[PDB]
Amino acid sequence: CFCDHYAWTQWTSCSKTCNSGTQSRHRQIVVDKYYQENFCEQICSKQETRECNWQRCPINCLLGDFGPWSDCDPCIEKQSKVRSVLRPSQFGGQPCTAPLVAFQPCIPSKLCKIEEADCKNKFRCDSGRCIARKLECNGENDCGDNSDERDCGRTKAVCTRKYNPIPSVQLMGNGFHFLAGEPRGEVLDNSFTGGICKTVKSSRTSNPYRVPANLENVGFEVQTAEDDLKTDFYKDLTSLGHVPIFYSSKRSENINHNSAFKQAIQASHKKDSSFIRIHKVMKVLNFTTKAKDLHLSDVFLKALNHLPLEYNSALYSRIFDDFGTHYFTSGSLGGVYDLLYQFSSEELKNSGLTEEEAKHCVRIETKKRVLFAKKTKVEHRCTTNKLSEKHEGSFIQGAEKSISLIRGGRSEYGAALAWEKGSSGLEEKTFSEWLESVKENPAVIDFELAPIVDLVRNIPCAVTKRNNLRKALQEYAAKFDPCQCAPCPNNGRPTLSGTECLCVCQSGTYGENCEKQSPDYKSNAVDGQWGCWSSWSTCDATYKRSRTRECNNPAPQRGGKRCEGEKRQEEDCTPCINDDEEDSGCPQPVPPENGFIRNEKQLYLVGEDVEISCLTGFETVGYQYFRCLPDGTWRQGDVECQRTECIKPVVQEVLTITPFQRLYRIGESIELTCPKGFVVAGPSRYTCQGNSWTPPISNSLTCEKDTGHCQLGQKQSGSECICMSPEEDCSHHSEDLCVFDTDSNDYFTSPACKFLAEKCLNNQQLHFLHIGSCQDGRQLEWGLERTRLSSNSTKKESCGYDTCYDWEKCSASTSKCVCLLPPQCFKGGNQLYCVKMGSSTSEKTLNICEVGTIRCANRKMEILHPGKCLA
């Protein structure tokens, strides 16, 4: 039978327009005579099916509704608001572009707020940083602003000599964002030096460099070897798979670089690709970040505080962006020559070289052309194979291009090392230029990390904002997980970059979604891959809570690897928590009896003094200060409060105190006495009052020599008194007198004894005046006015004076003259009419008696002239 007698219908339309439908067509069979007779039913196929439109349907970015508005209390009154990427762009879908989090102007719950409570016995840099007072006036900027050193009068040097800092030491203190493979903000302070002077010596470079406190180990010895120039081969990039965990870049050897990988994945699509990598680290330093008590950076520490206590996904994640994900525990500093070469697997297979051979040809070619390798034998296996043959014997130039994974130096210079047709990169000149840059701009290389979380350990609520942080981090990485991705054409393994999913191709496949396969590639299996996690479960009676993934997404198929890991995961679950805990002076001392301390407190500083004083009627005897001992104990003098006591008065060896005591009690008297010829000038009895006497003449007291009817004017001889000679008879100077001389208009001092004696004859020429030595006084003037009365006056008195003025009267052995009232003018009074009274302010008539009685008593008037007055 001829089957095409019954012709095909048209293919139907494809059941789908993408993601691979089917279509069919069938013979147009009529059961006619010819049909039944030619066994057409037994021998003809009657239908055809085939797949169609197997191109992937493009998937467009899908964001979600926004979250609840976010309160604001920065000095920037803006409101943060977030939505997230539900579905990531794929296979040429529309990428997402309306930014994830949008902020606006805000209404403040509280006006601009700043904090002030931080430093107790610590010192406050005016920057606000709080450092150990120990670190003050020590010849070193420990504050930053050097405030801790401003006007220091003298300083305790930490370091004997000025040592210089490791240059670029800060780079080992900056944060590391794992996912993005780039260093972020300064996170450790690595200039901080604690006052402690640790140092370390460069090989063959003069003076030691100054190690900072955070570096437990620094190294300057640099090894050179072949081992250092390493090459790997990659049949495809799916190999790179090795939650971010603390690792080493010696172990992983799988680098993410913001563009690096993506370029290479994009390259891998252009055609069936294999990759040869070749790198060589170029060190200037080892270094080991000391494990605990790291000195954070200002800016980091500040920001790491303005973080709320209650969990807050939005603002926590922000630290990762700003500061990173890890921080360097150990590493080196310099640069890394690192190039991923891209080779077309058809070329390689046509070259017939094995991986080991090809890796080698790139090794020795790099060595000759880029590194300045002294000289070497040519190797025809690398030079005359079918690939190198088409490029003047270069194997490297058989590549499509190189991608640069170089770290170190300025990017301009790294980029040049990456060859492509007609470009630079296989010229020594080029390599040396980069190499310069790498000294001028090192980078941390060959380095292990640690989660940035283990750094936030000594703030107010460390343990709080620590677990607050692991949460904000888990959810951070959640956001970058490839599970969100639709699966890929041939066991391609999806990887999320930003908000789109690039397909990483298995060797033997290319095309923009790894759809095209080369004639070698055969498989048709499908390895399993986790769908996304599930949502957390309600917290249980037990801490127990739950989460769940399903090995769907690409469901495992046709003998393809079931996805490996867990379908479920259990963590436990049921405030402001501090971090765990890792001189003091003395109490008020006890006075000695009858005293008290001059300063009451509950607590004294070690080394403080307090003074002991005494109640009234007592005085301290002994050192009067107690000192606070480090002990918490008081150092005490033998001090006490003794009762007041007078001591022994001013001893002139002449006098004799009695009772003789060395100390007298308040209330007891002494009797000062002198020998027979002598008598005490002052009183004979002083008494002890409050530790002084009544009162101690301090030498103004010694025993001077102090112990008949003739009346002492004349001396006896023949039972009859006769006038004594003044220059021959007068011995013991009588009291010194002040006598006046009418004949000489002159006064002078004289001994009474002589005066007396002289009186016998000339006395009507010399008049007494004042007791004591001559000296200006009212008496003088008075004795003047007296003597002026002059002639006409007669005197019959003998007090011992013994002369008495007319108006006065001797007191009869009482020893001095007295005044009179005008009433008693018995004896005749010469007529001194003219006199001014003063009271009546007039001139009236008055006798010498009345005139005399007024000048003696009050001396309160002026005598105009003897003889009649105006009145």
Ligand X SMILES: *[C@@H]1O[C@@H](C)[C@@H](O)[C@@H](O[C@@H]2O[C@H](CO)[C@@H](O)[C@H](O)[C@H]2O)[C@@H]1O
Ligand Y SMILES: *[C@H]1O[C@@H](C)[C@@H](O)[C@@H](O)[C@@H]1O
Ligand Z SMILES: *[C@@H]1O[C@H](CO)[C@@H](O[C@@H]2O[C@H](CO)[C@@H](O)[C@H](O)[C@H]2NC(C)=O)[C@H](O)[C@H]1NC(C)=O
Ligand U SMILES: *[C@H]1O[C@H](CO)[C@@H](O)[C@H](O)[C@@H]1O
- CB nearer ligand Z, residue 65 or residue 221: 221
Which of ligand Y, ligand Z, ligand X, none is residue 354 near (CB under 5 to 8 Å by kind)?
A: ligand Y
Binding mask 316-335 for ligand Z (x = CB under 6 A): --------------x-----
CB neighbour list of residue 76: distance below 8 Å, 6 or more residues apart: none
- CB nearer ligand Z, residue 208 or residue 219: 219
Burial of 507 (0-12, 13-18, 19+ CB in 10 A): buried
Query: Residue 307, annotated ligand binder?
Result: no
HEC sequence for 610-669: EEEEECCCEEEECCCEEEECCCCCEECCCCEEEECEEECCCCCCCCECCCCCCEEECCCE
CA atoms within 13 A on the CB side of 617: 5
- CB nearer ligand Y, residue 354 or residue 811: 354
Binder of ligand Y out of 216, 322, 346, 355 (CB under 6 A): 355
Q: Give me the least distance between CB of 555 and ligand X, in Å please.
A: 17
Of 523-531, 591-599, 626-634, 653-661, which segment contacts ligand U by CB under 6 A?
A: 523-531
Query: Residue 121, annotated ligand binder?
Result: no
- CB nearer ligand X, residue 87 or residue 277: 87
- Asked if 528 interacts with ligand U (CB under 6 A), we say yes
- Asked if 530 interacts with ligand U (CB under 6 A), we say yes
Binder of ligand U out of 99, 153, 519, 565 (CB under 6 A): 565
Contact positions with ligand Y (CB under 6 A) in 135-174: none
Of 2-10, 225-233, 593-601, 736-744, which segment contacts ligand U by CB under 6 A?
A: 2-10
How does DSSP classify residue 732? S
At residue 35, φ and ψ (nearest 5 deg) are -55, -60
Q: Give me the least distance between CB of 522 and ligand Y, in Å please.
A: 16
Binder of ligand Z out of 37, 115, 151, 221 (CB under 6 A): 221
- Asked if 166 interacts with ligand U (CB under 6 A), we say no
Of 100, 104, 112, 123, the closest CA to residue 73 belongs to 112
Query: How remote is the C-alpha of 450 from its chain's centroid?
Result: 27
CB-based contact 735:772 (threshold 8 Å):
yes
- CB nearer ligand Z, residue 227 or residue 720: 227
The string of DSSP codes covering 348-367 is: HHHHT--HHHHHHHHHHHHH
- Asked if 356 interacts with ligand Y (CB under 6 A), we say yes
Q: Give me the least distance between CB of 563 and ligand Z, in Å please.
A: 36
Query: Which positions lie near ligand X, rule CB under 6 A?
Result: 16-19, 57
Query: Residue 142, annotated ligand binder?
Result: yes
Binding mask 4-43 for ligand U (x = CB under 6 A): x--xx-xx-------------x------------------
Residue length of the chain: 871
Name the closest residue to ligand Z (Cβ).
219
* Long-range Cβ contacts of 808-812 (<8 Å, 24+ apart): 808/856
- CB nearer ligand Z, residue 446 or residue 758: 446
HEC sequence for 171-193: HHHEEEECCCCEEEEECECCCCC
- CB nearer ligand U, residue 13 or residue 700: 13
Point out which residues pair with 787 in neighbouring strands: none
Of 115-123, 156-164, 216-224, 483-491, which segment contacts ligand Z by CB under 6 A?
A: 216-224
List the structure tokens of 448.
Answer: 């292990």
Q: Encode burial over 470-488: b for 16+ CB neighbours within 10 A, e otherwise.
A: eebbeebeeeeebebbbbb
Q: How many residues bind ligand Z (CB under 6 A)?
A: 5
List the structure tokens of 292.
Answer: 């605990």
Query: Residue 743, annotated ligand binder?
Result: no
At residue 218, φ and ψ (nearest 5 deg) are -125, 140
- Asked if 219 interacts with ligand Z (CB under 6 A), we say yes
3-state secondary structure of 313: helix
CA atoms within 13 A on the CB side of 14: 12
Query: Residue 217, annotated ligand binder?
Result: no
Q: Give me the least distance between CB of 19 and ligand X, in Å please.
A: 5
- Asked if 394 interacts with ligand Z (CB under 6 A), we say no
- Report the relative pairing of strands 104-105 and 862-865 from DSSP bridges: unpaired
114/527 Cα distance (integer angstroms)? 56
Which of ligand X, ligand Y, ligand U, none is residue 533 near (CB under 5 to 8 Å by kind)?
A: ligand U
Query: Residue 148, annotated ligand binder?
Result: yes
Which of ligand Z, ligand X, ligand U, none is residue 286 near (CB under 5 to 8 Å by kind)?
A: ligand Z
Which of ligand Z, ligand X, ligand U, none is residue 11 near (CB under 5 to 8 Å by kind)?
A: ligand U
- CB nearer ligand U, residue 552 or residue 803: 552
List the structure tokens of 842.
Answer: 């007039």
- CB nearer ligand Y, residue 322 or residue 355: 355
- CB nearer ligand Z, residue 288 or residue 548: 288
Binder of ligand Z out of 60, 170, 286, 423 (CB under 6 A): 286
- Asked if 532 interacts with ligand U (CB under 6 A), we say yes
757/510 Cα distance (integer angstroms)? 159
Of 239, 767, 325, 190, the closest CA to residue 507 belongs to 239
Which of ligand Y, ligand X, ligand U, none is residue 16 near (CB under 5 to 8 Å by kind)?
A: ligand X
Point out which residues pair with 690 in neighbouring strands: none
- CB nearer ligand X, residue 16 or residue 836: 16
C-alpha to C-alpha distances, 359 to 17, 371, 417, 446, nearest whole angstrom: 45, 16, 18, 22
Q: Give me the least distance between CB of 416 and ligand Z, in Å please.
A: 30
Report helix angle 778-788 to 848-857, nearest 10. 170
658/388 Cα distance (integer angstroms)? 134
With vertex at residue 781, the alpha carbon angle to CA 779 and CA 785, rounded to the nearest 5 degrees, is 110
Name the closest residue to ligand X (Cβ).
17
Of 147-155, 213-221, 452-460, 570-578, which segment contacts ligand Z by CB under 6 A?
A: 213-221
Binder of ligand Y out of 354, 524, 537, 599 (CB under 6 A): 354
Residue 262: CB atoms within 10 A of its CB come to 17
Interacting residues toward ligand U by CB under 6 A:
4, 7-8, 10-11, 25, 243, 477-478, 481, 483, 528-530, 532-533, 563-565
Specify binding-site residues: 135, 138, 140, 142, 148-149
Contact set with ligand Y (CB under 6 A): 354-356
**Which residues fall in the annotated binding site for Ca(2+)?**
135, 138, 140, 142, 148-149
Give the footprint of ligand Z on this chain (CB under 6 A): 219-221, 286, 330
